[PDB]
Amino acid sequence: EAKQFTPDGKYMPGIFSKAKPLDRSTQWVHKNPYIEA
């Protein structure tokens, strides 16, 4: 629900945004310990 952009572009990093910012790491999997071993 965050706002990482302005109404006119201008990507905002949103360092101090309460919501979790969508990023490159957004679609990372949750590793399975047995699989990792």
Binding site: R24, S25, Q27, W28, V29, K31, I35
Partner: protein
């Protein structure tokens, strides 16, 4: 030469750019690699196939450094200069720009070298660059860099006494006089075989590549896959056959059997791989072995077929690496069992995965198909048993290819969404080039 020096100085200006203006940093770093692509285009427009077998000759006095152009070197230069901007498009640090600029300079200089000592000096000047590239602190493996650097140094150290011995024997290091003097073909031949069997992945001494090409990032992965193995094939074609033919002949059964067993074991080993990147790593071994056998066959058109296959792999395999890199970066893992339902999740990306998988599998409407047809024509004319051995195991590579593709693509949708504009643009040159060379490569 003057133009080349201008590019050399112009590329170095990256470090002189203050880091404050990142936009211009990216622009300059990309344009520096853009320029040589147009320069090689201008060269190709300048070449004459009705002229001498070598054109654009230049020598830097008594400093060795003999530079001349054949079709093989020009085509390899074109393919490399196409590859490099994509690699630049995948980097974010000035250090990476500098390293890849130096690597590209070294590759281009070696690609048209005509001095065996010159090739020796210029080729392995990038070994430290690869060492720094592969074993990066946060994500790389030091062991892979250690491996590859030791293998390359071992090869070069084996070769060097042979190089200096033939130098003293003939008083020079130019190929066009090395090819014209009587020499002890055997020792130099062993040196050349050792180096170019280390460089091109050939069993048994080939084990550095599976770790190296996987530990490296996407740009270095594409570089290593599409360039440094072809340095071996152009090495054969430019040096070994023109200089020492008798050694080439007396070793032909050994080279052939080694290539065959390499192809067979690599093909069988690939199915047991559990990571996509390792699967792509083993894939190139069979192609390189096929190239080497085609070169050593010398039956009807061996050099041209080998060049065609080298171009085909340097076109297709980097696309596999691009897809692998996109999936890893937007997934943070390379482990197969975390890939599923990719077609519904990444429609265009999965379609590209399919197309380039078929490209790896030598199917019609692709340059790889004509490449392997010509290579098998050359092999068959020498003998039919080797051609049958290559023909019989065609199913075994496509086996792992289709298995991995279907396993990761179909099934339960889970993972990243489809590709971005930058990723599609990176994919684009390989698709267009493969289509163009698989429809009307010649005219």
């Amino acid at each position: 030469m003057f133009i080349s020096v201008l590019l050399i100085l112009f590329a170095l200006c990256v470090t002189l750019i203050p880091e404050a203006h990142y936009h211009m940093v990216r622009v300059w770093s990309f344009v520096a690699t853009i320029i040589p692509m147009w320069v090689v285009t201008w060269m190709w427009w300048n070449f004459d196939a009705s002229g001498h077998g070598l054109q654009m000759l230049v020598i830097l006095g008594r400093s060795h450094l003999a530079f001349g152009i054949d079709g093989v070197a020009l085509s390899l230069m074109l393919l490399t200069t196409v590859l490099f901007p994509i690699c630049m498009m995948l980097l974010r640090t000035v250090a990476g720009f500098m390293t890849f600029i130096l690597l590209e300079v070294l590759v281009l200089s070696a690609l048209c070298v005509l001095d065996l000592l010159g090739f020796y000096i210029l080729f392995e000047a990038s070994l430290i660059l690869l060492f720094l590239l592969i074993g990066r602190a946060p994500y790389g493996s030091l062991e892979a860099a250690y491996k590859i650097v030791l293998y390359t140094m071992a090869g070069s150290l084996v070769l060097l006494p042979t190089l200096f011995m033939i130098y003293s024997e003939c008083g020079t290091t130019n190929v066009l006089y090395m090819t014209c003097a009587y020499n002890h073909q055997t020792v130099l031949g062993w040196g050349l075989l050792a180096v170019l069997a280390v460089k091109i992945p050939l069993m048994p001494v080939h084990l550095w590549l599976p770790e190296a090409h996987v530990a490296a990032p996407t740009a270095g992965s594409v570089l290593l896959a599409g360039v440094l193995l072809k340095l071996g094939g152009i090495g054969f074609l430019r040096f070994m056959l023109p200089v020492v033919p008798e050694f080439c002949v007396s070793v032909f059964p050994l080279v052939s059997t080694l290539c065959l067993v390499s192809f067979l074991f690599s093909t069988l080993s690939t199915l047991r791989q559990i990571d996509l990147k390792k699967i792509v790593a083993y894939s190139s071994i069979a192609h390189m072995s096929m190239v080497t056998l085609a070169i050593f066959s010398q039956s009807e058109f061996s050099a041209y077929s080998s060049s065609f296959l080298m171009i085909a792999h340097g076109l297709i395999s980097p696309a596999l690496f691009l897809i692998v890199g996109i999936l890893y970066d937007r997934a943070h893992t390379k482990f197969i069992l975390y890939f599923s339902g990719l077609g519904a999740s990444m429609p265009i990306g999965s379609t590209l995965f399919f197309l380039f998988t078929l490209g790896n599998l030598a199917f019609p409407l692709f340059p790889n198909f004509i490449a392997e047809v010509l290579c098998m024509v050359s092999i068959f004319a020498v003998h039919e048993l080797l051609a049958y051995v290559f023909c019989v195991c065609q199913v075994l590579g496509a086996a792992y290819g289709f298995w991995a593709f279907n396993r990761v693509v179909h099934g339960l949708p889970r993972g990243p969404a489809d590709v971005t504009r930058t990723e599609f643009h990176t994919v684009l040159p390989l698709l267009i080039g493969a289509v163009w060379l698989g429809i009307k490569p010649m005219a």
